Amino acid sequence: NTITKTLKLRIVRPYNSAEVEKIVADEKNNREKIALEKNKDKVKEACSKHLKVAAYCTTQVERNACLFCKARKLDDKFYQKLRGQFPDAVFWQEISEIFRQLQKQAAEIYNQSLIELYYEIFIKGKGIANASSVEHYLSDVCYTRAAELFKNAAIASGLRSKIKSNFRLKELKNMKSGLPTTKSDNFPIPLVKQKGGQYTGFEISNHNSDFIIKIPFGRWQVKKEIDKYRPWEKFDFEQVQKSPKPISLLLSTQRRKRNKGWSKDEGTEAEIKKVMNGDYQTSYIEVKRGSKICEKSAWMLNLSIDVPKIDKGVDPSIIGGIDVGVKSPLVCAINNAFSRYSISDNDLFHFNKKMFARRRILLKKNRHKRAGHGAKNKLKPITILTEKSERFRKKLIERWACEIADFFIKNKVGTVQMENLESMKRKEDSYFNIRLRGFWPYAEMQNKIEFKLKQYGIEIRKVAPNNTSKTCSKCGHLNNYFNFEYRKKNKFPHFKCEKCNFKENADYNAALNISNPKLKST
Amino acid sequence: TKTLKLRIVRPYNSAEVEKIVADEKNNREKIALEKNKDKVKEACSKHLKVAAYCTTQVERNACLFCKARKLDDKFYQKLRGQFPDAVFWQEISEIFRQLQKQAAEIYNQSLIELYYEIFIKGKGIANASSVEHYLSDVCYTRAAELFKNAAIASGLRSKIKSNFRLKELKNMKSGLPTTKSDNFPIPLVKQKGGQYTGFEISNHNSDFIIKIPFGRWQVKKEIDKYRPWEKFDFEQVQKSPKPISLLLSTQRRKRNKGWSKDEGTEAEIKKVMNGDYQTSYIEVKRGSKICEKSAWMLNLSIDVPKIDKGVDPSIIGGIDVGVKSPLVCAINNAFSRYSISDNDLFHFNKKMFARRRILLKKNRHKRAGHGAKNKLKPITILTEKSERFRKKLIERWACEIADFFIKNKVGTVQMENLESMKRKEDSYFNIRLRGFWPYAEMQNKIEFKLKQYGIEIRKVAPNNTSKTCSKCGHLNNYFNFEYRKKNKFPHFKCEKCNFKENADYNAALNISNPKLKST
DNA sequence: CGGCGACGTTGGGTCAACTTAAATACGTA
DNA sequence: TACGTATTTAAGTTGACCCAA
RNA sequence: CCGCUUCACCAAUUGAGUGAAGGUGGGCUGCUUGCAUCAGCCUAAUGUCGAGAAGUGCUUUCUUCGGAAAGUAACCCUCGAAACAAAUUCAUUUAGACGAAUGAAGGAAUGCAACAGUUGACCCAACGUCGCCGG
DNA sequence: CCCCC
Ligand SMILES: [Zn+2]
Ligand SMILES: [Zn+2]
Ligand SMILES: [Zn+2]
Ligand SMILES: [Zn+2]
């Protein structure tokens, strides 16, 4: 009945108190008054918003070239004054050292507690374990070690949920996988705090149109003798019941207030307005690093969120279908309505070929290229393009999914059937393996279209894919001549029926056969 | 160490049982012949010559005779009733799967119990003596009492001792490598040194016979319901010996196509039987390639000493410029080319010409009042940095070329002469980069990097290369440069020899010929 | 530049699982 | 006793491949 | 210059061809992302280096199968290093110039389109060396 | 056993 999501927000700064933030806001307003009175007709770069409240000038500038906006920025002498004046305040050096230490010890506890679970279940408990015995062993092992290190209960139960997400019991009993280990460096901090029924969850306050989140935390004390092999470990984290000290964080919604739908009811901005209202409680929080934005890393925060379904006036008596192809990207059909949709944008397949070709050039003769300073340094140009290509892929798939969903909602289509495609991964074909496997995300496309349709109350039926491209959509003749080897050697032609003389596209015919409700779901 | 992987098509029973099986395939072929007096017309790929009366050919795979020549399960079942010692591919597939799952279980649980005893209950203070104590007191004894072979026990103990990396696990650079019990190999250590030749491998008609000593495998009197895969017992080696003989083939699929003979392992197996190359490690594992996942493949690991050759002056190499790549290397009697790629040069030049086109456009109005001198400040430095880039690129190319000639064991490289190198319309330079290249610095750094490694240079300077073929000295004069430009730079096709190869490589071959004297 | 066998790094496909719920110490109103 | 927030705890097996080029 | 875009042409979509115009033809920051534009900047960047010693390797010593110590630094060894703006401080030549730091706290666009994210497992592919076989 | 080059 509810659909789970995450919101990704950027941490502006740690929020501190109400008196220290009153001092910060008044120092910003004092600098604004100082620059608003010292620039007495000396400058004329008042920004369009700054003309209204107080300025006496003519022209409008881009808000980057304002001088009263520029003066509101606080320097480092004010923050060493505030660290001296309020020594119980919370600033970024403590916070970034805590967050990096949390990340590294959460990865270490994840590894050691999965190995300890494998011991207690399979070596000590002789393999005898149900699923509820895995629930007991998770809360008895992973929570207990994580709460023996971090005396938070939020981090310890978040690490229990992170180990629970990746511990598969019968796959490790039947030896169908290896035991999971982390090698990652940006491992999240998983941070559950319960939200059902009589609980609220993490206590998001909205002070002056801001996104303040509060993290229940202990009183950190710097280690006396810091270890020289592991110098990131320099805090102690007392118990949250003995001596609490909750880290509040301000989260970046200033850019999102300029976005086109913030005064709407459906986007990511309406979800953030609802979380700001006190609707849409969150029970899950992940803190990760972003990219190194000017030699100091950005920290992002993911708010898991449970969202209802939207009405849209959409009924399951109208049935649609989607044919996932590599030549033609995505073609949507309706069962009886003579309506049709066909993607025509830039393609993810051509983009994957281009990125693979460039990656082949850059890897092609590495031995003297940038040698001598490690594996990470050596493969630096490719990874910078891998982040950008993953972002471009994801945004292209999401734009295709919104075009598909806008088509299907415009025709009031309630059930979209799709192909099963659970057997494609097992294919022994050399061509598929070497030329089509890693460059054609059919299932990531399918999952994002299931997600986008599921947000609107549209059901998705995985429909068995046998003889779908060759059966005719008018009179279901099952043209057996229209095999894949004939679709190959005829250079992938239109569909021609043998007893109807029916002529439509090969990707639209299989879209209108996928749309048929008679086929058995799988 | 070299690991040579073979297939297993079937076990080798004995002389008499394999005689009965081969006579049964011949008798089924004879009965399928005499019941079909030209009913169907498949005729096999070549059985048409020996004994068939049928019209057209088939690929041997859609024939009628082979699907009768493929035996039936019940025949092997009545043979297993009639012969108690004959081993077949269903029973030994069960034994291989159960031994794979057992050894993977012992390996996984021994790594996790090592990690527990060392890093969790033992607070991270544990030398390798505690690892050797755990192995020889717990894991070797467990593997020597579950399956009583000392080969699989001392192979599992060695695979865990080598695969448990204490120095990399103490500092948490890595985690534990745990497997999937289909990718796990069954180790089977025996000695290499002197007395033990190792597993007593013999030969067949383009096949091999490996005689692993093993046990008797009485079936369990009551299968354990909660572990249903463990259905054998593995009685001891010295009490009831029953050595498995397997039949090993070199055939592999050409990416799921027909069987090609792999001669790269086959030569090494010939060196095994001839008396040298004593083997010491026979792993059994499932196949990893496509259309081989249900095939049991047998890796012979064999140890060779790290012995260099040096360079020998009989091998003669050559460097010549190309038209799509700046430098092509070649050896006369081998294939062995090494074409230096263009893309980093091309993209450096693309960015340098973009910076030139920009700094010569936004100087006419901005840089003004002081003359052209104000304009000239930026370019002098960009081209200086470009020359330093070209110098580092030429040093990288010299490193690549010298690594190529050391790996391919070349002792004397013959380069074209300097003025004959630069006066060339068949170069990548003078077509794209109009003149801007240090040929003298390039040749001096290639000469110095090669003379660092004890390789001579010769300066042969041919009269007319880039159209003379190598296999015959034809002087194919139809290679005009103006012909090459209009025909989109085509390959080298010999007229009388029909030798199809690259136009860069045969031109790199005519420099490497020793029949033309130094100049 | 093609195969074949190891080891190593990476990228990048599918797929699975998480984003729970009841009870209780410790403290306060 | 009502409420809040941080803390802890929930239990027991049961393969899989289907082939002698 | 373009293995850059568009238009016109020729030969048979490749030319890494002819002509005219235009443009980083590679990136960074602009407050979650993508594309285009805009302001500023870097660019030898598919580059060149710094510091180290946990590991692979290598040398020496030791009961020396195992393994440990010390060192060397080849490594697809570890960590890093270009790129918006206001502010602050110092040195040096004659208000200006250079070197140059300490750093986060909403100082930074416009338009269109979006905005579940993380962890792990399995598999395939590319590449690097290391050996064998063939034309 | 087809869905996809
Ligand atoms: Zn302003
Ligand atoms: Zn029809
Ligand atoms: Zn025959
Ligand atoms: Zn010839």
Numbering used by the authors:
A (entry chain A): 4 to 525
B (entry chain B): 7 to 525
Provide the publication's sentences verbatim.
Cas12f, also known as Cas14, is an exceptionally small type V-F CRISPR–Cas nuclease that is roughly half the size of comparable nucleases of this type. Cas12f associates with a crRNA and a tracrRNA, which can be fused into a single guide RNA (sgRNA), to target substrate DNA. An asymmetric Cas12f dimer is bound to one sgRNA for recognition and cleavage of dsDNA substrate with a T-rich PAM sequence. Despite its small size, Cas12f contains all the conventional domains of Cas12 proteins, compared with other known Cas12 nuclease structures.
